[PDB]
Amino acid sequence: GSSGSSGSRGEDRKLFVGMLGKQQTDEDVRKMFEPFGTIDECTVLRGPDGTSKGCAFVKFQTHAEAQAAINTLHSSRTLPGASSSLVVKFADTEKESGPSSG
């Protein structure tokens, strides 16, 4: 009842996608994630042989849009030859936490 789903911690547009296949690329993911918002920055994590390690970061135009995707995309479909479904969850960027004076 207009409550429950909405409410996630981590104010960060960027998102961490997993369970990706060599077939799926920035193009697919982008056009596949766009349907849930306008993407601005999309980078895929690959190795030396341009092989999709199985993860990619997505940066929507706004947070609201970011959550939208996950809400659904998250464990939604099961890309070809992929153990689990499309694992979509907010991403985390190195931070600086610690004592203020010392």
CB 55 within 8 A of CB 70: no
b (16+ CB within 10 A) / e for 54-92:
bebbbbbeeeebbbbbbeebeeeeebeebeeebbbebbe
- Please count the structural domains in the chain: 1
Closest among 18, 15, 11 to 60, alpha carbons compared: 15
Question: Per residue, what are the HEC states of 33-100?
Answer: HHHHCCEEEEEEEECCCCCEEEEEEEEECCHHHHHHHHHHHCCCCCCCCCCCCCCEEECCCCCCCCCC
Three-state secondary structure call for residue 18: strand
Please give the method by which this entry was determined. NMR
> Token pair of 72, please?
């659904």
d(CA 18, CA 1): 30
DSSP state of 26: H
Specify the DSSP element, H or E, that contains 15: strand 15-18
- For residue 96, the domain's CATH number is 3.30.70.330
Find the domain containing 58 and state its range: 1-102
Distance separating the N- and C-terminal Cα atoms of the chain: 48
